[PDB]
Design an enzyme around this catalytic site. Structure first.
Site, PDB file in Angstrom:
ATOM      1  CD  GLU A 148      -3.370  -0.131   0.291  1.00 12.55           C
ATOM      2  OE1 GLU A 148      -2.800   0.748  -0.805  1.00 12.55           O
ATOM      3  OE2 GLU A 148      -4.188  -0.568  -0.374  1.00 12.55           O
ATOM      4  CG  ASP A 149       0.992   4.154  -2.571  1.00 11.32           C
ATOM      5  OD1 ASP A 149       1.459   4.557  -3.350  1.00 11.32           O
ATOM      6  OD2 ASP A 149      -0.723   3.945  -2.439  1.00 11.32           O
ATOM      7  CB  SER A 150       5.181   0.683   2.404  1.00  9.06           C
ATOM      8  OG  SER A 150       3.621   0.298   2.552  1.00  9.06           O
ATOM      9  NE  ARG A 165      -0.982   2.810  -7.155  1.00 11.65           N
ATOM     10  CZ  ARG A 165       0.283   2.818  -5.590  1.00 11.65           C
ATOM     11  NH1 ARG A 165       1.434   4.208  -6.189  1.00 11.65           N
ATOM     12  NH2 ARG A 165       0.368   2.329  -5.122  1.00 11.65           N
TER      13      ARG A 165
END
Ligand SMILES: [Mg+2]
Ligand SMILES: [Zn+2]
Ligand SMILES: [Zn+2]
Ligand SMILES: [Zn+2]
Lengths: 129, 98, 50, 205, 7, 50, 99, 1404
Positions: F15-17, G41
């Protein structure tokens, strides 16, 4: 001459649409105190509320007992616990809590506070351990 | 650091309290308000300097201790500054039949 | 103006009398300086280019 | 097709109210002829309590819904006869409910005869069998004794209950009056039906 | 410094 | 031009880490100087620095 | 942290050199990016840039990757093979903590 | 002395007159001086008697310091009276209704003695009354003129005689008003107009004006000192020039002090923030200081992931742990434990910072307590935050009940970590991600708050969603893919097995007790299913569901392993199938974690989530997982296949274009050629299902990381893969293609005008991996910008709607009867109609619903004993099935697409209890026993009869007191489920004691599922319905925006919540069923009816019209040729000769032949729909034979019967009336399509069959009356999306059901639990009318709750109306107690606690 900090005039537009005679006696004007109430405790066999504590009621009982054990500490518990929270939780679980639960069913216009008094030591406990 | 409207809504949806109390009063501007209970107006109470008085009805002062916040006291003062009289009825005393 | 978006498009319709462009565009001219930092931006979702 | 539906459904409205019919029943064509000529049709029904209920079916272009004086005269004349007259029902078009003058004579006549119940209703209220509508749950009037015992068990006043208008189509077909209680069996997608008791309040108009 | 506002 | 491995390593980059090399940080990767200013003025002649 | 494709990243863990994964030829990453950040994305420009820069580093070149320039991912992947690497940019890696 | 404890029960609002100011004032302002040196000047506005705001002095009035002084008001005796700025409108109203000479009312009080009290004065002032003669003093009432130069000056106009109404004169006028007049005009005796004029204003306490607002007060005092104290103004005195200016500036100063920069509707007139400006808006007093607050003892930081933390744990940096402190009170039981904290002090962690010594009643620094050795009993120690402490974790915006949760603190001792670390599976509670999000963390320090945090707000209570009644947490991203990779049968390397060493390594970080591997050799091979079973055996559950991995769209390609496409878990053992999003994913209803929470508690569920996540991550630690550029690269053959598919799409588009060019595209009735062409193009450019074939031909599914993430549900979808690899396709914005906005007929500068190619209108033929061209990138940027705009404004729209819903519903609270009431007025007779918590429900199938009469007997009719009891039991079962069918088929009838379902959400899964007891039973296949079977039947029957007693108590159950009807209905579903699952056929191998245990377990589970007393269920419903609203916004670009179907944004939800009328609805729809069950199957008949009821007016078919002043039995020259067809009409219509009342006025209209052809409108239809419609008319048409070139002309000649106002204007109005006549259809229906309806019907065998061949008309626009008038529509099954239409025709109950249905439609598939919709609908219909969620709805529902309405919006008007009306505000709910500084009496405070005096005396 240029002022920047304007206040943004504020406008309300939706108007509300809520739907002998002597000067004043000492009764109609005044008497803000509100008449005292008498506590009408419903008999134990006429009670209709649950015999199980809600999580709100059990949590409040534990919190009150633990806060009281913070200043006090004379405890009826057998095993020694190092925190007031654990002591209060075990008091509720061991049915030794010295508190009562009053459920105000209704306040009558005549001045009666009809309540049900419940003993947490004869009630169902929903908490975890 | 702010605990806004939505944080209070979440806390009261969990039915918490005692944390709304702690954060909004003990960790915030929470204070003690005194009301005469006979007229409903803010009374003057001081334990150290002996003051038990009401600028309204004087010999009828029956001061009650009401938990409040300085923000609410300021809000009521502001309403009264706009010539709106704020009177707190206060919960009636309830007595067990002896 | 009727603009060919690239010299490749102009070359494709070199003999097409039904597509008579008045001008030809260089494709990178539709992006600003910060958008052009992204490499292969046309291969990326445009929101990610933003 | 308003007049046809009115003709076929007003009589089942009367029957659903448990009212015995009076006079006779006329064909559709004679019904519309009377509606166009006299300006309205009157239906008389008798309740179980030996009272009389009169239903007035006015016309959309009738003179009685365009001039207030004519409506005043009709109401005064009909109320001047010798009948118990438990309720007067006047079925009019929807814009007639917006013409304030007619509503003013209705209010004046209601004040003139307090013991007499006068209600004015739109056409769509009697253009369908309201109790048989799928979207409408079963409404039933409960006696004051049952309501009192329910309120006593619940520690409730009649004003604490959810409200329902006396002009509500199910309540109109039931004949409920303000101050009464209606028990509603509503379908539920959480408990597979439920029971709710509502307090009947003043009818719109 | 509430007293900075003078007389 | 950081070397990037696109992989799962202990669930620490979910999660975007991102998992960063501590050595890369120590060697000066993205290291720099942050500057803060402190401007203070003498209100009037009744104030001075000392 | 962020790439030029709009993929923000918060540094959640810093690992020593020995704990970082490494390839058979000793290559290790500065950053480890979750592959799950890619599908929704659709930041394929970042993947293409990684593939092109892999061959750029071994060739000692700085290729232009401006948008709308003629691009062929298959040809670039073939270009990876001419530098001794696999068709994809994938290499045999070892877990730094366990070997 | 000894001010006793008290609580505010009600608040009274009144107008404060000068007498009240004199009584309440502690001092009288007389001077203009501010400060006498370092101290306030006595008698000034800063005088200390008013309170202290500075540390430099005490109060004097209360002898308190700045902190303990609440401030006290003063008095300024105005030398001239001033009008009250807030009640200028009240002064104006009073001036126009009472005689200005003797004070008698000029109006007739008997005239208004039928209105409500709040309206009598308004209507009295509405009447003119100018020139009226008083019946007491025979004076003439002047014209009360409000000066337009300011907001307070009043002018007396006596037939042109102009005199200023000064406040002194106004007070003289108002003092002559009797209280009888005040009461008869609907005003309270506390609202006498004499209080509207102030000779002594109140200077507010210094507590609200700290050391600008005091500049205005100083200016007011200075200007008041100028006016002579003996000024005595009478009517007509001619104050010369300077007293007038001084009085005007004093009144203006007071008006600006109170109401500067605030308008309010009650403001009459025209032309330093004020007191009333401090209140409103977000930064105002109420919202910023009362409803929210800044707090101490709180921390904020960026959040990052930490997979080594449990779901109920949070990583706390140590530097923050030495800043926030926990208050532990030293007693005998904790002195030994707290001593190390005291000894560590401020030098070592864990230590302490402050000590509150009880003997000194003050706080002591730890560095000054070096001589105390130990701690005393009653001391309070403020120690550092340590591991295991509870903390409140919060992420803004706080929209869910789980937005604030309690986690156990894990203190991170690394000094270089400054972030709040959390498990990635805990992010679902907060809707958080690790890309820059910041979260607030505060550690409860008080004992009560800590008790509550660990007992009530722990995140284990939020594992099950209150909104969706399903699990919130689960495996996410790497954990889902890891579970799939670990549980798959085969790898590219062969069978998915590991040796003993690597099997042990999977459990290294599980934080559980490891399983035993002693029975495994070092060379033994263990498959992933074995280790998953080793983990899941601790919480044995039964699971059987197809995984997300198996998708039918993928099945033609790939080769699915048969052991991977059927996931089965039996008693915690994974037999077959893979684990992915369906089984282990977050939010997966019916998943393994949901079952674990149902059988063993949500704490076990969170522990299992952590353990399985560790297992999956440790597996990926060896298996590895990656995505590359080659993963998204098609093979050249697959690229050619994709190109061929797109070529076929473009060829179909070109065929449609060729049809358009030759004029072959004929639109149906209801669409223009442009709309039909756009629909055809949109249908032609959709990608086929076989677009996956080239993608899967290029993809190795056992190796492709992108495909594995998409297929297992970890991340992405099929459209993402298609866009990346094959092509984006058509760019759709609001259901339509790219509009030609560049120029007239141009979409971009890159495409020609009126281009017909699909690429010019947003069709993108290239994939992302192939790269986009400049126009393709521009269209993609338009779509992405739409997404960004929708995401941005979703937050704001959701905030508006959420705040409105919260303030409309917050007062709804569950009471001790488990009803929902606003204060005392009922909203629901029982919460959610079942009295159950949304977190305690499970979806369960009812086996008897779909069974026919024979399978019901063959499965549930027990024939082993010849007893009537089993006949009665089967009759009860059949009657339950019939009642369920009737109820949920009726529900089908008043809904659009709400199908009858076999499954229901119930508190107790009886079948699971029976299965568990049978599995744990130490027996099997018991011998036949008639007595035991009959006894079990009797026990089940009695348990069903006594089931509604779980809603009351055991006492009433023992007494067998009567059960209320609604409580009997509340247990109907559970009685049904029990009688189904505990039928005699199903309970043959269960003993009587086992039956008793089963019934006891059912009773316990039912009791545990009830909603708590004092729950804020209104706020729960508001959150649960507002949360899906942002997702509804996120799909705003996927919804139509055109007229008549405007569903973009929040148009539909605002229509629902604001109770907007029918005319205000932009997406009104209706569903009509044919009144013939046997002919609903004919699609042609349905289309006939749909086109028949479509509304066509005369105006729709008019090209142009001309009204003429010519009679007939002269002629506008431009139409002199009309007399040919005119005479032809005269010849062809012998019985239609012009009548002998023909007037001059007449319309001549040209019929549009194109519209007539397209709408199938015939001239005879017009002639008969106008002739037998219009009484005073004479209509004539041309010979309809007209081809292209000669027109159809309709001349309508009027008659003087219509003219029976200006003649031309009424003639034009008649023209307008004629044009709007309904030629065909039903009014209000713009369009009417034909839809295929799915419905259930019971056939002759008692079976419930789902029928797909039903046709119905889905109209555009609603007219229930019109739809019920036509005889081709079933009148009893009309479904309209309009709430107002349903209310007006059906009633408040049907309106409530319609509100439920419409909110459910708006929420969509991922909607909240039904009880939240019930809450919304029951709040909005509690008064018998459909009230809104706006200010008006609150005014209708809670008029007395002044504080709540001030907190919602418009505080100034609400306060003014409350003061004028003398409103009494009882303190209830949340907003009113909060605005008074108190706490709401709900949740833990709903029930009060008293001391058990008897028990304390007898057990000291
Ligand atoms: Mg974020
Ligand atoms: Zn007093
Ligand atoms: Zn003071
Ligand atoms: Zn007079």
């Amino acid at each position: 001459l240029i002022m920047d900090d304007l206040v943004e005039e504020y406008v309300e537009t939706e108007e509300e649409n809520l739907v002998e005679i002597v000067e004043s006696p000492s009764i109609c004007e005044g008497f803000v105190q509100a008449s005292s109430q008498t506590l009408v405790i419903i008999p134990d066999n006429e009670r209709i509320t649950s015999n199980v504590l809600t999580t709100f009621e059990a949590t409040r009982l534990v919190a009150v007992r633990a806060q009281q054990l913070a200043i006090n500490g004379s405890t009826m518990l057998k095993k020694k616990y190092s925190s007031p929270i654990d002591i209060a939780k075990q008091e509720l679980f061991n049915r030794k809590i010295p508190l009562l639960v009053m459920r105000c069913i209704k306040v009558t216009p005549e001045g009666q506070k009809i309540v049900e008094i419940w003993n947490p030591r004869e009630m169902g406990i929903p908490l975890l351990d | 650091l702010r605990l806004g409207e939505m944080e209070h809504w979440v806390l009261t949806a969990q039915g918490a309290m005692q944390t709304i109390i702690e954060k909004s009063h003990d960790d915030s501007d929470g204070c003690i308000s005194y009301i005469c209970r006979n007229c409903g107006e803010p009374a003057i109470y001081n334990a150290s300097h002996p003051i038990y008085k009401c600028m309204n009805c004087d010999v009828q002062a029956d001061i009650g201790m009401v938990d409040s916040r300085r923000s609410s006291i300021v809000f009521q003062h502001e309403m009264r500054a706009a010539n709106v009289n704020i009177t707190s009825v206060l919960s009636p005393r309830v007595f067990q039949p002896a | 103006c009727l603009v060919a978006f690239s010299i490749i498009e102009l070359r494709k319709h070199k003999h097409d009398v039904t597509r008579r462009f008045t001008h030809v565009d260089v494709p990178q001219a539709i992006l600003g300086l910060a958008a052009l930092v992204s490499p292969y931006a046309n291969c990326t979702q445009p929101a990610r280019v933003t | 097709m308003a007049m046809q539906k009115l003709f076929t459904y007003i009589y089942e409205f009367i029957e659903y109210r448990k009212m015995v019919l009076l006079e006779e029943k006329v064909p559709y064509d004679k019904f519309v002829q009377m509606v166009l000529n006299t300006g309205f049709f009157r239906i008389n029904a008798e309740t179980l309590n030996h009272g009389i209920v009169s239903v007035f079916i006015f016309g959309a272009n009738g003179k009685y819904v365009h001039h207030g004086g004519d409506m005043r005269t009709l109401l005064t004349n009909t109320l001047n006869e010798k009948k118990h007259y438990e309720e007067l029902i006047l079925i009019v078009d929807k814009p007639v409910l917006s013409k304030k003058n007619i509503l003013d004579i209705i209010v004046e006549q209601r004040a003139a005869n307090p013991t007499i119940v006068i209600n004015i209703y739109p056409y769509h209220l009697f253009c369908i069998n309201i109790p048989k509508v799928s979207a409408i749950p079963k409404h039933k009037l409960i006696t004051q004794e049952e309501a009192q015992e329910f309120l006593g068990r619940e520690y409730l006043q009649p004003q604490d209950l959810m409200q329902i208008s006396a002009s509500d189509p199910p309540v109109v077909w039931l004949g409920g009056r303000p101050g009464d209680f209606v028990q509603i069996e509503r379908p539920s997608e959480t408990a597979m039906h439920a029971v709710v008791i509502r307090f009947i309040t003043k009818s719109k108009i | 410094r509430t007293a900075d506002v003078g007389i | 031009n950081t070397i990037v491995a696109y992989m799962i390593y202990g669930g620490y980059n979910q999660e975007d880490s991102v998992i960063v090399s501590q050595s890369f940080i120590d060697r000066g990767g993205f290291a720099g100087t942050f500057y803060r200013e402190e401007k203070v003025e003498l209100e009037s002649d009744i104030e001075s620095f000392g | 942290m962020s790439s030029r494709s709009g993929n923000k990243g918060i540094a959640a863990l810093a690992l020593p050199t020995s704990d970082m994964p490494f390839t058979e030829d000793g290559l290790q990453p500065d950053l480890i990016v979750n592959p799950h950040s890619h599908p929704s994305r659709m930041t394929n420009g970042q993947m293409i840039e990684t593939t092109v820069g892999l061959a750029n580093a071994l060739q000692g070149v700085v290729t232009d990757g401006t948008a709308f320039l003629p691009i062929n991912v298959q040809l670039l992947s073939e270009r990876l093979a001419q530098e001794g690497l696999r068709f994809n940019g994938c290499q045999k890696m070892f877990n730094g903590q366990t070997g | 002395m000894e001010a006793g404890y008290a609580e505010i029960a009600a608040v009274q609002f009144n107008i404060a007159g000068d007498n009240d100011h004199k009584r309440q004032g502690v001092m009288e302002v007389t001077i203009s001086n501010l400060f006498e040196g370092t101290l306030p000047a006595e008698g000034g506005i800063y005088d200390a008697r008013m309170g202290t705001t500075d540390h430099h002095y005490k109060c004097i009035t209360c002898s308190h310091q700045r902190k303990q002084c609440m401030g006290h008001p003063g008095i300024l005796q105005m030398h001239a009276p001033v009008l009250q700025p807030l009640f200028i409108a009240e002064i104006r109203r009073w001036l126009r209704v009472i005689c200005l000479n003797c004070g008698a009312p000029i109006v007739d009080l008997k005239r208004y003695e039928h209105l409500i009290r709040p309206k009598r004065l308004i209507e009295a002032a509405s009447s003119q009354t100018e020139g009226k003669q008083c019946y007491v003093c025979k004076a003439v009432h002047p014209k009360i003129v409000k000066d337009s130069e300011d907001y307070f000056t009043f002018w007396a106009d006596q037939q042109g005689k102009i005199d200023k109404l000064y406040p002194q004169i106004i007070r003289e006028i108002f003092s002559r008003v009797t209280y009888d007049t005040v009461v008869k005009l609907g005003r309270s005796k506390n609202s006498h107009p004499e209080k509207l004029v102030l000779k002594a204003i109140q200077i507010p306490p210094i507590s609200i004006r700290p050391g600008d607002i005091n500049n205005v007060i100083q200016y007011l005092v200075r200007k008041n000192l100028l006016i002579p104290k003996d000024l005595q103004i009478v009517r007509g005195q001619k104050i010369p020039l300077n007293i007038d200016r001084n009085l005007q500036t004093i009144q203006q100063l007071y008006y600006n002090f109170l109401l500067d920069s605030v308008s309010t509707t009650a403001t009459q007139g025209g032309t330093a923030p004020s007191i009333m400006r401090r209140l409103p808006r977000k930064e105002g007093r109420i919202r910023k200081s009362l409803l929210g607050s800044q707090v101490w003892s709180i921390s904020r930081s960026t959040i990052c992931g930490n997979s080594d933390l449990h779901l109920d744990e949070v990583g706390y940096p140590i530097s923050f742990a030495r800043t926030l402190q926990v208050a532990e009170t030293v007693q005998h039981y904790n002195i030994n434990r707290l001593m190390p904290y005291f000894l560590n002090g401020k030098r070592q962690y864990p230590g302490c910072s402050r000590v509150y010594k009880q003997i000194t009643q003050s706080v002591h620094d730890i560095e000054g307590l070096k001589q105390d050795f130990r701690l005393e009993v009653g001391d309070i120690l403020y120690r550092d935050v340590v591991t295991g402490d509870v903390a409140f974790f919060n992420r803004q915006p706080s929209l869910e009940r789980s937005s604030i949760g309690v986690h156990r603190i894990v203190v991170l001792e690394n000094p270089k970590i400054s972030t709040f670390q959390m498990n990635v599976s805990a992010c679902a509670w907060y809707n958080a991600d690790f890309d820059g999000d910041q979260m607030n963390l505060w550690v409860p320090w008080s004992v009560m708050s800590r008790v509550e945090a660990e007992l009530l707000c722990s995140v284990r209570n939020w594992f099950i969603s209150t909104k969706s009644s399903g699990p919130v947490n689960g495996q996410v991203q790497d954990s889902t893919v890891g579970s799939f990779l670990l549980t798959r049968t085969n790898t590219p390397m062969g069978k998915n097995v590991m040796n003993k060493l690597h099997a042990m390594g999977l459990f290294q970080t599980t934080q559980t007790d490891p399983p035993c591997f002693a029975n495994y050799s070092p060379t033994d091979l263990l498959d992933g299913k074995s280790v998953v079973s080793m983990l899941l055996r601790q919480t044995p559950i039964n699971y059987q569901r197809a995984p997300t991995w198996y998708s039918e769209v993928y099945a033609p390609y790939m080769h699915y392993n048969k052991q991977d496409i059927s996931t089965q878990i039996r008693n915690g053992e994974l037999i077959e199938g893979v684990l992915d999003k369906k089984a282990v994913g977050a939010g997966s209803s019916g998943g393994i974690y949901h079952l674990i929470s149902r059988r063993y508690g949500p704490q076990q569920a969170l522990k299992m989530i952590f353990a399985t996540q560790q297992l999956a991550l440790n597996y990926v630690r060896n298996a590895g997982f990656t995505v590359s550029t080659a993963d998204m690269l098609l093979t050249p053959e697959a690229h050619q296949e994709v190109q061929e598919i797109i070529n076929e799409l473009l060829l179909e588009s070109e065929e449609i274009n060729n049809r358009l060019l030759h004029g072959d595209i004929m639109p149906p009735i209801g669409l223009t050629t442009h709309d039909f062409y756009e629909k055809l193009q949109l249908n032609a450019l959709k990608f086929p299902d076989r677009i996956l074939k080239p993608i899967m031909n290029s993809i190795n599914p056992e190796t492709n990381g992108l495909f594995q993430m998409v297929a297992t549900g970890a991340k992405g979808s099929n459209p993402n893969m298609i866009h990346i690899m094959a092509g984006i396709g058509q760019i759709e914005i609001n259901t339509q293609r790219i509009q030609p906005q560049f120029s007239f007929g141009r979409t971009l500068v890159y495409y020609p005008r009126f281009a017909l190619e699909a690429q010019a209108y947003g069709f993108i033929c290239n994939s992302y991996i192939a790269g986009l061209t400049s126009p393709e990138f521009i269209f993609g940027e338009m779509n992405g910008r739409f997404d960004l705009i929708n995401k941005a404004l979703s937050t704001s729209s959701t905030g508006y709607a959420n705040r409105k819903a919260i303030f409309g519903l917050q007062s709804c609270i569950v009471d001790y009867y488990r009803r929902v009431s606003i204060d005392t007025r009922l909203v629901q007779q029982l919460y959610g109609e079942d009295g159950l918590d949304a977190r305690q429900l499970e979806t369960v199938r009812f086996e008897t619903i779909m069974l026919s009469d024979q399978e019901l007997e063959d499965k549930f009719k027990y024939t082993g004993i010849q007893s009537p009891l089993f006949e009665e039991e089967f009759s009860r079962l059949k009657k339950d099935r019939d009642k369920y069918r009737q109820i949920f088929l009726n529900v089908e009838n008043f809904n659009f697409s709400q199908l009858l379902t076999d499954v229901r959400q119930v508190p107790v899964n009886v079948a699971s209890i029976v299965k568990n007891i049978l599995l744990s039973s130490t027996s099997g296949v018991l011998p036949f026993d008639e007595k035991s079977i009959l006894q079990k039947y009797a026990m089940v029957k009695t348990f069903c009869k006594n089931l509604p007693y779980v809603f009351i108590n055991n006492i009433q159950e023992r007494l067998q007191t009567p059960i209320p009807v609604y409580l009997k209905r509340a247990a109907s579903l559970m009685r049904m489920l029990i009688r189904i699952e505990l039928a005699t056929v199903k309970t043959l191998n269960i003993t009587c004691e086992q039956m008793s245990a089963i019934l006891d377990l059912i009773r316990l589970q039912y009791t545990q599922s009830l909603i708590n007393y004092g729950e804020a269920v209104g706020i729960l419903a508001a959150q649960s319905v507002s949360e899906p609203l942002t997702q509804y916004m996120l799909d705003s670009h996927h919804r139509s925006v055109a007229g008549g179907t405007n569903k973009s944004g929040i148009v539909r939800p605002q229509e629902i919540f604001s109770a907007k009328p029918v005319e205000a609805e932009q997406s009104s729809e209706m569903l009509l069923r044919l009144k013939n069950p046997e002919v609903e199957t004919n699609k042609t008949y349905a289309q006939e009816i749909a086109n028949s009821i479509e509304l066509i007016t005369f105006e729709r078919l008019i090209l142009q019209w001309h009204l003429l002043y010519e009679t007939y039995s002269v002629m506008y020259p431009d139409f002199a040729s009309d007399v040919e067809w005119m005479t032809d009409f005269l010849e062809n219509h012998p019985l239609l000769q012009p009548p002998e009342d023909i007037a001059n006025w007449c319309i001549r209209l040209e019929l549009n032949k194109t519209t007539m052809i397209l709408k199938s409108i015939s001239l005879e239809s017009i002639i008969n729909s106008l002739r037998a419609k219009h009484p005073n008319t004479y209509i004539m048409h041309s010979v309809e034979n007209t081809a292209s070139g000669i027109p159809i002309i309709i001349r309508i000649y009027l008659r003087e019967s219509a003219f029976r106002a200006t003649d031309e204007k009424i003639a034009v109005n008649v023209v307008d009336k004629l044009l709007n006549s309904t030629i065909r259809g039903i009014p209000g229906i713009k369009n009417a399509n034909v839809v295929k309806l799915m419905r259930h019907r019971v056939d002759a065998q008692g079976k419930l069959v789902r029928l797909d061949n039903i046709y119905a008309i889905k109209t555009n626009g609603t007219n229930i009356f019109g739809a019920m008038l036509d005889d081709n529509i079933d009148p009893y099954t009309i479904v309209s999306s309009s709430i107002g239409d349903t209310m007006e025709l059906y009633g408040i109950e049907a309106a409530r059901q319609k509100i439920i249905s419409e909110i459910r439609t708006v929420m969509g598939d991922k909607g909240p639990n039904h009880r939240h919709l019930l809450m919304y609908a029951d709040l909005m219909t509690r008064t018998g009318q459909v009230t809104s969620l706006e200010k008006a709805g609150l005014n209708a529902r809670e008029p007395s709750n002044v504080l709540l309405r001030m907190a919602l919006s418009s505080p100034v008007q609400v306060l003014t109306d409350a003061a004028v009306d003398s409103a009494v505000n009882p303190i209830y709910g949340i907003a009113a107690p909060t605005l008074m500084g108190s706490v709401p009496r709900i949740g833990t405070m709903y029930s009060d606690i008293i001391m058990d005096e008897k028990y304390i005396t007898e057990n000291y």
